[PDB]
Design a protein around this ligand. Structure first.
Ligand code: SF4
Lengths: 109, 73
């Protein structure tokens, strides 16, 4: 759901601005995580974090801990996927926006 | 560990959702609350929450912890 891919991109950009967090300096990292969130949202109904493995994804989405923005990000601003990085982080660039073109390249592959 | 246990946050845990410090960094170390849940499964299906101990504090505030960050009062 390409509408969902665009909705997820907008979410990421708005959430980064609201939390004073920044995207990875390598925006393809960001794009891969945004595409995984959308994929999960299409498959499972919720944006289950894409940079983890699970024993039971349906149970995870019901529990809600790892649905984006996850518990660790909401409470401690910790994002294991490196989608939302605090300004001090070595991998933080300066963008809080990602060109749609960049996500389209990840859909291309 | 049990639901209902009183615990003290003994590790330094910096959070951003406290109702008195909305959006700003606040260390919960030293605060005391009660265990409200220990997340190990959702309807019999093991789940992977990595901050499984949900602790309720005063002022309608709750936060999640690893078992090693809290101490049974
Ligand atoms: S670690 Fe949390 S905030 Fe980061 S992409 Fe995964 S679910 Fe979203």
């Amino acid at each position: 759901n390409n509408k969902t891919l665009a909705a997820m991109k907008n979410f990421a950009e708005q959430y980064a601005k609201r939390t004073d967090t920044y995207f990875c300096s390598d925006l393809s990292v960001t794009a891969v995580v945004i595409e995984g969130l959308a994929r999960h949202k299409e498959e499972l109904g919720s944006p289950l974090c894409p940079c983890r493995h699970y024993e039971d994804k349906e149970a995870e989405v019901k529990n809600t801990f790892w649905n984006c923005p996850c518990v660790p990000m909401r409470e401690r601003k910790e994002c294991h996927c490196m989608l939302f990085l605090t300004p001090d982080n070595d991998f933080a660039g300066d963008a809080q926006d990602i060109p749609m073109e960049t996500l389209e390249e990840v859909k291309a592959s | 560990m049990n639901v209902g246990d009183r615990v003290r946050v003994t590790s330094s845990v910096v959070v951003y959702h406290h109702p008195e410090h909305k959006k700003t960094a606040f260390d919960l170390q030293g605060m005391e609350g009660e265990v409200a849940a220990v997340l190990t499964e959702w309807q019999g299906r093991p789940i992977s929450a990595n901050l499984p101990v949900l602790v309720k504090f005063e002022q309608r505030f709750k936060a999640h912890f690893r078992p090693d960050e809290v101490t049974l009062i």
